[PDB]
Coordinates of C-alpha atoms in Angstrom, one line a residue:
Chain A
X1 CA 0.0 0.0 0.0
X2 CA 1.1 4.0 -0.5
X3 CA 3.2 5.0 2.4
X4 CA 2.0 7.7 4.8
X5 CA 1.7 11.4 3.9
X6 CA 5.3 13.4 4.1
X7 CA 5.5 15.7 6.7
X8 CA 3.8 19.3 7.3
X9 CA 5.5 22.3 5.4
X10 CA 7.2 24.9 6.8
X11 CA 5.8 28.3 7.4
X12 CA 5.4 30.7 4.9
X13 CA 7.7 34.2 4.9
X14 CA 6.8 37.6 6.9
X15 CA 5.0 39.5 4.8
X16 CA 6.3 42.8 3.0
X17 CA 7.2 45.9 4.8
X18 CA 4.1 48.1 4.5
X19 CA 4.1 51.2 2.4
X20 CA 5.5 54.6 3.0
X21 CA 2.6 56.7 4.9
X22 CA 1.4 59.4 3.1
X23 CA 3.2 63.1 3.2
X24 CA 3.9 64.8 6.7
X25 CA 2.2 68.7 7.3
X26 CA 3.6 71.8 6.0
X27 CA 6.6 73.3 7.8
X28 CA 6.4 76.0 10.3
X29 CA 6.1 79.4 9.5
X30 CA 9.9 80.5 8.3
Chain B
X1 CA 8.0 -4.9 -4.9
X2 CA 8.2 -2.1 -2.0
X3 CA 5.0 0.3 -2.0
X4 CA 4.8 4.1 -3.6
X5 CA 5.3 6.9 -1.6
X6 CA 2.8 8.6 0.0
X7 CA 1.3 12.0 -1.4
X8 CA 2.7 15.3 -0.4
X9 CA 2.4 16.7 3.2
X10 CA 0.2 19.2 3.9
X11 CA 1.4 23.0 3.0
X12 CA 2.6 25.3 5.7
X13 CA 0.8 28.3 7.3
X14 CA 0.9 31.3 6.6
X15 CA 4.0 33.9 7.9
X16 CA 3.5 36.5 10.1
X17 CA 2.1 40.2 9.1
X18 CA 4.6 42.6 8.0
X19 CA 6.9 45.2 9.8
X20 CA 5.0 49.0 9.5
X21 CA 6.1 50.8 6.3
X22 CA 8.1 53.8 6.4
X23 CA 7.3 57.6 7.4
X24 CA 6.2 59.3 4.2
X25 CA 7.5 62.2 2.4
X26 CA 8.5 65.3 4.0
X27 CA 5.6 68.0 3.5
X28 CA 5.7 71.0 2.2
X29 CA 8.1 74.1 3.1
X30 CA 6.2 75.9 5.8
Chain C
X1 CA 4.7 -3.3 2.0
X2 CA 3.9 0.1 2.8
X3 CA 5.9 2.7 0.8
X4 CA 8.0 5.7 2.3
X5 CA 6.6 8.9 3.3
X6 CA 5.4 11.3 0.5
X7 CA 7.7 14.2 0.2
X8 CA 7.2 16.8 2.6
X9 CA 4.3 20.0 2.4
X10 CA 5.7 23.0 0.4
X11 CA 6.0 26.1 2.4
X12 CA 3.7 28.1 3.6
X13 CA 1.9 31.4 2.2
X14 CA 4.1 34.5 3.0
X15 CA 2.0 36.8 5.9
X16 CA 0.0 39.9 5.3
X17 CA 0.9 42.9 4.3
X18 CA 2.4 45.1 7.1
X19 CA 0.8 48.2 8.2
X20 CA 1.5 51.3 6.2
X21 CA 3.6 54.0 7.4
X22 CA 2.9 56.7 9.0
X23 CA 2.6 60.3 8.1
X24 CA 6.0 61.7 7.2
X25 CA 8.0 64.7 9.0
X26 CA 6.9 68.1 8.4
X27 CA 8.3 69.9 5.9
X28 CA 11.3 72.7 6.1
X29 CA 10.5 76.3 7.6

């Protein structure tokens, strides 16, 4: 008969780094 | 004479969640 | 007989996104 199933696989990667935020406020006055 | 493998193992779970993403641009001049 | 083990589970799905960034610095005076 067909031998047992191999073995569980590993776990996956981190996910990617999210993305940039959007841009910061206007300076201060100057 | 000996018997087949078995199928595959089961796939792996999923990785963890991403670091956060990066500040965004600097804003505007003030 | 029984046969060998089947050939181990590929790897798992890579995680979620991460969280996007936060709001940059202000800009120059």
């Amino acid at each position: 008969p067909p031998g047992p199933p191999g073995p569980p696989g590993f776990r996956g990667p981190a996910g990617p780094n999210g993305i940039p935020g959007p841009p910061g406020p206007p300076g201060p006055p100057g």
